[PDB]
Symmetry: D2
Subunit: 385 residues, 4 copies
Amino acid sequence: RPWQILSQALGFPNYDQELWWQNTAETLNRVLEQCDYSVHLQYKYLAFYHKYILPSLGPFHGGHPLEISVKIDKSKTICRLGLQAIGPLAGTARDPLNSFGDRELLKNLATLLPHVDLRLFDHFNAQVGLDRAQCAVATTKLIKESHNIVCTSLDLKDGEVIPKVYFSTIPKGLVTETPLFDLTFAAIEQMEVYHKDAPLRTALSSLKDFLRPRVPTDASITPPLTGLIGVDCIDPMLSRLKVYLATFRMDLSLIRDYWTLGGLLTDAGTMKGLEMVETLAKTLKLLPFGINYAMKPGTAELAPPQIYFPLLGINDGFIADALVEFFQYMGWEDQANRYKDELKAKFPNVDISQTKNVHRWLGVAYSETKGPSMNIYYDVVAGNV
Amino acid sequence: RPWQILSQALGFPNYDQELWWQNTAETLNRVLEQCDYSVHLQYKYLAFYHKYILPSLGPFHGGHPLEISVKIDKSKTICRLGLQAIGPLAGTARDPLNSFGDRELLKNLATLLPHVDLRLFDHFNAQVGLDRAQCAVATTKLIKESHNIVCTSLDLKDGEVIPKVYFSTIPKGLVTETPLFDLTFAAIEQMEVYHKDAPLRTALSSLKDFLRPRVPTDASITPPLTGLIGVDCIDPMLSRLKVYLATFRMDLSLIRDYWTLGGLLTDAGTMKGLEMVETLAKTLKLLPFGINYAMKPGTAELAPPQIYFPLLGINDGFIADALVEFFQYMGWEDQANRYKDELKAKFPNVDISQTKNVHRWLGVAYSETKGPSMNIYYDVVAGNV
Amino acid sequence: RPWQILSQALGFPNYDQELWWQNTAETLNRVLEQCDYSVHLQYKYLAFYHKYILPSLGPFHPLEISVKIDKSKTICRLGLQAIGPLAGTARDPLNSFGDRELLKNLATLLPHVDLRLFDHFNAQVGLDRAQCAVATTKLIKESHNIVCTSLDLKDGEVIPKVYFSTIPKGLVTETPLFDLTFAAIEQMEVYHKDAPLRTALSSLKDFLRPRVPTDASITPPLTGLIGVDCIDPMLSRLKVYLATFRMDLSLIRDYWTLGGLLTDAGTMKGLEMVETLAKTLRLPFGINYAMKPGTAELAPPQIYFPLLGINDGFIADALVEFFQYMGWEDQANRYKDELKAKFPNVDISQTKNVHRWLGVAYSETKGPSMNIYYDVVAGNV
Amino acid sequence: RPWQILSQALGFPNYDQELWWQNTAETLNRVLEQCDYSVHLQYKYLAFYHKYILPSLGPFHPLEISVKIDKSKTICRLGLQAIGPLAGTARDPLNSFGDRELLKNLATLLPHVDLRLFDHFNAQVGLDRAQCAVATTKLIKESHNIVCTSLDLKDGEVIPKVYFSTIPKGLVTETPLFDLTFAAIEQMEVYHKDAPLRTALSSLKDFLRPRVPTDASITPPLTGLIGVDCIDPMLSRLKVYLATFRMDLSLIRDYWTLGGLLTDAGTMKGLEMVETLAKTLRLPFGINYAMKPGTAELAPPQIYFPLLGINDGFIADALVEFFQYMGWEDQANRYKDELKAKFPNVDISQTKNVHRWLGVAYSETKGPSMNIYYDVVAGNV
Ligand SMILES: COC(=O)[C@]1(Cc2ccc(O)cc2)OC(=O)C(O)=C1c1ccc(O)cc1
Ligand SMILES: COC(=O)[C@]1(Cc2ccc(O)cc2)OC(=O)C(O)=C1c1ccc(O)cc1
Ligand SMILES: COC(=O)[C@]1(Cc2ccc(O)cc2)OC(=O)C(O)=C1c1ccc(O)cc1
Ligand SMILES: COC(=O)[C@]1(Cc2ccc(O)cc2)OC(=O)C(O)=C1c1ccc(O)cc1
Ligand SMILES: CC(C)=CCC/C(C)=C/CSP(=O)(O)OP(=O)(O)O
Ligand SMILES: CC(C)=CCC/C(C)=C/CSP(=O)(O)OP(=O)(O)O
Ligand SMILES: CC(C)=CCC/C(C)=C/CSP(=O)(O)OP(=O)(O)O
Ligand SMILES: CC(C)=CCC/C(C)=C/CSP(=O)(O)OP(=O)(O)O
């Protein structure tokens, strides 16, 4: 009902927006129900999605697909939306790298939401953004669906909408012929919060020392590489800063290396998470792999990253069986016994035992305070067509 | 909650729209609850009001106030919205009679709602609408809040939105120096449905014979007069056509004359409704009075009109006591025992025992098939300020 | 140059609008120059086209630019199908909203634009959603349209006109086209108060009754379009258009003279001219009968020759020859060069789709006139 | 005439936009003519102003048109405070969104517009919602603004500039203005990679340290504005503006020469000119120190004389006298007539608010220049 009511109440300004809603909103409503969001929050979020996200999605120019993800720990499941906002001139001479859509979205969110802060967005836009002529050069040197600089996620947590943004470093790297490592840390080392917070500066210096010998010292795009910077759109002093590595090679040895920061982290917390990540890899027998190093102001110590396993081209029925098995290993019997039925109900129009593109990523995390968590990213449109 | 959730989910494009929502939507949500609309329909209608009605309302140019009305019979209470849509150039040289806002609204409704039909709107717009130069002449000859030709109501019935429009005859009357009676019936006699439906033509001819000697034969604006034409925005063949009289004089004798069509209607149905209307007038000891004659294709017989009692300048605490008394007379004990508490809860920010502008109209009706009904029109903004 | 300056000053809200401008506005600017509109009017009309027409055009009948040529002057006109943002979907299957949106915007821009006739014909020949969906089943997939619009760029103003198709209501109601055409006209406010129009129409009916279908069929000749000016109903020309596939010298005489009703020298001079043009030279032929309130007498129609599928180099040579016959030596000596310059990105000697219609007219007061309709996009791609 | 043609072609989406056009566009057209912009550029810039500036202006600092006069030419510039649709409400208390909306639209219109410096300074001196609400308690009710914008109408292009106020972040953070100004500048990408800019800035700091507050107070002279060009950071002039209430011949010397640091004949020729202008002649005085990447040496500032509350007839006579002193006889003989013609709906001899600022500059390569800022609305109402 909510996704249908809102469709009857609001209609659509054009057919593209209708088509996006007809191929996403039922799934979104279902995910929200399954995660135990109340009716009022289902309406909150679907209304929000209708007004603010539909027009950002573009036509039904080369972007990553609209992704709904779930963050699962033993207590609860939190839903999140990941998108490439698309400007109305995206991919044309006037906007070759689609540099305006995501800021338009965030500007609109800043007058909607009382706790959204654009300062980190603006900071990183100044540091890794490009002018028109530089965007045109970057399109010549880039695969035709990487013609993007920023993208956006919306965490649907505690009855609020929490935006996050990701800035790609590659385009400025290609155009300026500057090493990715240098332009990443230079952009970070120029933040206001960096200049006033000793713990962040320590955490970063340790991260730099780990990354220096593993990533390129030259201007090449040779993995592993620092390809993305992530921030929360909140007070700079509260915001997690994230450095993402992209790489094509992952075996048990590189997992250990990335997870522990090459032997720096040796505590039982780290090793229990490591065992869990190694087990997951074995369970899957497994786009680049991602590694996400997270830092916060007021914290001098690096914690283990999150590792993202690409799932495109692996059968979704197998992934679902694999995840049930893995939830059993974790002692999450509740999650194991519903996952498969709940997956079928999110995507009723396809048979998951024949698809290979519905599960896209599986991110893994351990914290000592919070616990272990499972992040599953779905290509929503691929589960509705 | 729904009115608040939608405010958090959607925000506002400008301050005027926020201010309208802050002074209407809580009351609207409360009315909808009191009338037993489910949560899902409360969201349906409030979302609708947010997207479609807020931008039509204009700044927080001379129009009638946004009105929420309730239609009460013993079974149920139906909620309705009445508004003057305001175009963005309303009252300026480019649009002196605000001739565009209501059509903009209806165009938007025609792509939203599957059963909305514009043919009657367009027909009456062709017959009583004016060009720019004629609109400017009419502004010279009109009171500065009658600078309007059409207005709109939205019946919120059976989980649907049913639009109705009202066309004022006075402006074309003033500008063309044509009698109001003539231009009203001429416009009606030119309808497609009139040309093909003998019963409507009979019903109308009886109405004409009753109205001819009571309203002006000349071009004057001397009451009683045919001041408004009302239609439903549905298939012309299903649509009720309504002719409204405005007048300043009402005593028991004119009530009898209007109610029975000067002795034409003499059945017990008509006389029971008459007794009820006479009692209501006595109970109130009572803007013009309105009389609304309703016709439908396939019906050759006129039924008694609805009579509208203006309540502006009478104390709202007295009206509420008066209505409780009157609901008792009718044997509607349920409605009598809640009316006063429910009224206070619709308008918590004012003390109704001191206001005089919250109740605006009280319309009365009797049908033999449906039953007696009570129509109460509230100035929503006056109950929130 | 104006079309380039306005591009630099205004930009585009989206790529479709840019593309329409990049394939139409240079030509439009050139037509305006060739017709001797001043620089200020070139800017007036191109700025107008940018703000009001671009968004009506939809994603990138075809946008038509036409020229009305008599010996004194050449007047430029734009003919379009406005496209609503939900056109062709379940919510708007016959694109019934775009043209009214355009006209509402014009009613606040222009002091003399009147929507009463638009609204009257919309009420009479328009359809509701469910009837629009039935009509889409029974119609070719590019005739999913009810109204279109023209903008006459005359005397430094913009004069709108609208055209209502009768075919959809015909198919849905299974009513003869002749009956619904005249029924819609006979219901006008102006018809009820103007005897001369009623007479003129009764004579047109008497001529059309035995020539068009008495049944519900869509066979030619047929009353397929009603045209009105968006001005005071009492000043507005009402036009009834016939569409037909058969035209020979005998049918020309029949249509031109209303089957022998018109016999004056005015009529016969125009007849000789129209016969010659035919000799000099697949969409139907069009015949357009024009009536005005206060006029009881029918005049000869305008006849539209379809030119789609005929080579544009041949049409140009044919037109030069014909302008010579008329004693318009000036128009004959420039036509070919001016045509090349309107459409520089294409070779007009290779194309078959640039010239679309050639309408012809005679008046005794004004004179003979030539109306050339160009598919602008086909001369630019 | 262009401003009238564009009005007829484009109309207005709402009355506020009409009103702004009816009180600004005639003047803007007249200024452009007087400065010898061709008809095509008059249309370029008025069409631009219609589409992009009107909706930014809000409901009907004040919209300023300025002229930069040297002996060769006069260049026209527009200075505005863009106004967001929720400006001044709880959702946007310091109007922090309008100017970025305007610049985003300019970035797709114009090929050379760059937002990196805009974004950098927005991150450094901008505030979140709760901090914007605190600043509104501590600020006069028309200083509820953080950024404003100018558009230089030079060489047939539009060159945007932005100005960030430091005062709000100052009040909210209780940080000295001097510290936050330089901290924001010292964090630029270009500062970290350009030694000459760092040197130029260090010399400016050394001059400003003992003259402006060391505490958090808002007392003069103070660093109140940072100005940047919206172009490649490496080409962009960075400007630090002082606002002060006290100016005599001694402080002029002090500001002009950087307290004796600059002693060359270029500096002293400009100094004589600025002294004369002062003799010839309540908002503060402005002093604008300009730096560029690749330049290690500070040049003399531009000094802005406030003219609000002084009679405009007297200012005009004062300017004629001063153009004579400069040997600009042409500019002296037309100034007064050209001023009357810019503002025909008002009598400029009765007004005190039309001329707002008079900025003065010397370069050795270019020459002396005169910048006159007009409150356009005050010359039209
Ligand atoms: C801009 O980031 C992307 O588009 C991602 C992740 C990514 C990021 C960098 C890179 O070199 C390769 C992949 O590539 C994807 O296919 C994808 O789905 C990504 C992603 C997914 C979810 C999300 O919230 C952000 C990015
Ligand atoms: C256009 O109609 C109005 O504005 C009404 C009713 C009316 C109508 C005609 C007239 O000469 C005097 C009053 O005047 C009112 O004050 C008012 O509230 C009217 C009304 C109210 C509700 C509604 O749904 C339609 C009209
Ligand atoms: C709805 O009318 C059209 O689309 C026209 C003319 C037409 C009109 C009726 C008909 O039965 C068949 C064709 O068909 C065309 O191909 C075309 O170019 C038409 C036209 C052109 C210009 C104009 O102002 C109106 C219609
Ligand atoms: C925020 O800056 C302004 O609004 C200005 C200049 C100013 C700047 C800083 C300050 O502390 C006091 C005044 O104050 C004015 O009255 C005015 O007209 C200013 C101005 C004018 C044009 C321009 O391009 C920028 C600022
Ligand atoms: C291949 C690379 C480097 C990254 C792509 C992986 C991906 C889906 C990144 C977004 S991670 P995010 O949704 O923001 O998750 P949290 O870090 O807050 O748990
Ligand atoms: C003074 C005059 C003539 C009329 C004003 C009275 C008024 C409030 C008219 C709208 S009546 P309406 O809401 O459409 O009620 P229904 O007839 O369907 O019951
Ligand atoms: C009806 C058929 C088959 C073709 C006619 C083509 C057509 C509608 C041309 C426009 S006629 P129009 O431009 O409105 O010209 P005028 O009658 O005012 O001279
Ligand atoms: C800072 C004070 C008090 C007044 C200055 C008034 C002001 C900001 C004028 C604009 S300076 P601007 O137009 O940007 O001119 P240029 O420096 O490029 O010559």
